[PDB]
């Protein structure tokens, strides 16, 4: 669960590979379940360079790319718990109150 999709539900390869040293984590409504009759209406997805102090994230029904920029973690991947990523659930999050920010 929780990793970049290798294939879309129509059986076609997802035609995108990540950069040399970037961790990615991806979450959707119905997990890994390629049951040929489901519809994931949403996604929540995040990336960090293993060596970067920023984790970047977006969801289905949002404009912008939202970051956190905690100088603390610098050698982690988004699989680690202490990164404050957007896990399974909270997948739409059309709004953000006080946690992450990209606006002014």
């Amino acid at each position: 669960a929780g990793k970049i999709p290798t294939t879309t539900m129509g059986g076609k390869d997802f035609t995108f590979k990540p950069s040399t040293n970037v961790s990615v984590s991806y979450f959707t409504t119905n997990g890994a379940t390629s049951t040929a009759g489901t519809v994931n209406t949403d996604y929540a997805v995040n990336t960090k360079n293993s060596s970067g102090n920023r984790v970047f994230t977006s969801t289905n029904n949002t404009s912008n790319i939202w970051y956190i920029e905690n100088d603390a973690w610098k050698g982690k991947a988004v699989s680690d718990s202490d990164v404050t990523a957007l896990g399974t659930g909270d997948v739409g999050k059309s709004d953000f109150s006080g946690t992450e920010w990209k606006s002014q």
Partner: protein
């Protein structure tokens, strides 16, 4: 080239990577809807054509 040149690029790649991608969800659901209402307004002409042949609307299925 120069370290300062490689500091503007990363300062622009960051800009051009967030340009407020809009929610293209409502603008597609409207098309799916207007296929079904078109399809119904067409289906009605087949029903009310078939009545004026047989004095009855068709049997179901």
């Amino acid at each position: 080239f120069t370290l300062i040149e490689l500091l503007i690029v990363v300062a622009i790649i960051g800009i051009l990577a967030a340009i407020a991608i809009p929610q293209f969800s409502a603008y597609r659901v409207k098309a799916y809807n207007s296929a079904a209402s078109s399809d119904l307004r067409n289906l009605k002409t087949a029903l009310e054509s078939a009545f004026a042949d047989d004095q009855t609307y068709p049997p179901e299925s």
